[PDB]
Design a binder for this molecule. Sequence first.
Ligand SMILES: CCCCCCCCOCCOCCOCCOCCO
Ligand SMILES: CCCCCCCCOCCOCCOCCOCCO
Ligand SMILES: CCCCCCCCOCCOCCOCCOCCO
Ligand SMILES: CCCCCCCCOCCOCCOCCOCCO
Ligand SMILES: CCCCCCCCOCCOCCOCCOCCO
Ligand SMILES: CCCCCCCC
Ligand SMILES: CCCCCCCC
Ligand SMILES: CCCCCCCC
Length: 170
Amino acid sequence: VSIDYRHEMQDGHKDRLLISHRFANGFGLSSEVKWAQVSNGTEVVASYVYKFNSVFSIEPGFSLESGSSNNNYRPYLRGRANVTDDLSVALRYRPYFKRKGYTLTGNIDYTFLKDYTIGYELEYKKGTSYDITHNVKLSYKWDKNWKPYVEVGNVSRQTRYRVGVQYSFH
Ligand SMILES: CCCCCCCCOCCOCCOCCOCCO
Ligand SMILES: CCCCCCCCOCCOCCOCCOCCO
Ligand SMILES: CCCCCCCCOCCOCCOCCOCCO
Ligand SMILES: CCCCCCCCOCCOCCOCCOCCO
Ligand SMILES: CCCCCCCCOCCOCCOCCOCCO
Ligand SMILES: CCCCCCCC
Ligand SMILES: CCCCCCCC
Ligand SMILES: CCCCCCCC
């Protein structure tokens, strides 16, 4: 189980608290509460990660969000390839049916010096009623329980900044 708090600003603000767990069988569940300045929301996600082998995995997922402004059903399929022990790549297709469109999100993540991770995320969003996002995240496993992190992204025009920390139970 982990609990992840994150603050976001551009150049109002957004905050979130995301609690999640992935079981050794592959089943995962998360619940997130979000507030922004006012709006609020909650999201729940259930998924299975199915590992074909040490390199390739596929993760179908189900999510519903309920809010002031965002209210969507967003199922998804995420494929992952471990290129090396330190380097992974993923691609996620996530349509949204909200009150429709889809996002396509690619991720490249590289772990170095045991405790650091640098991640690049490219996200393409297209409505049916496009935007491209570039994001860089840097995380540091400070100890067995705490993983602070920062993200800087460009949303296309403007910059989106996040700071957060993930606490893991042991
Ligand atoms: C939701 C904020 C980000 C996740 C941190 C909450 C984890 C709760 O377990 C904390 C146990 O270790 C902390 C011991 O120090 C107590 C500090 O109390 C603040 C907890 O909210
Ligand atoms: C395995 C299928 C999907 C798992 C969903 C689990 C969540 C079920 O909880 C429903 C109970 O509602 C609690 C309070 O409702 C607040 C609104 O919920 C936010 C998103 O629906
Ligand atoms: C992006 C569309 C293709 C991805 C598969 C659809 C996922 C939504 O499935 C709906 C069923 O919801 C229940 C699933 O909850 C258990 C976790 O397993 C994920 C399978 O959906
Ligand atoms: C790893 C398996 C799961 C990954 C998703 C499976 C299928 C994804 O289809 C993508 C749908 O978009 C079609 C065109 O792709 C456009 C790529 O981005 C450039 C924008 O034109
Ligand atoms: C081992 C690979 C993983 C590390 C990759 C991290 C660095 C990747 O940086 C690419 C991010 O590109 C950001 C582009 O910024 C958008 C510029 O938009 C114009 C300014 O408004
Ligand atoms: C099992 C720990 C995550 C909690 C998710 C709650 C879903 C309603
Ligand atoms: C993995 C079984 C379901 C866990 C749900 C925890 C309470 C909402
Ligand atoms: C301490 C040097 C500044 C690092 C800048 C990083 C900007 C993304």
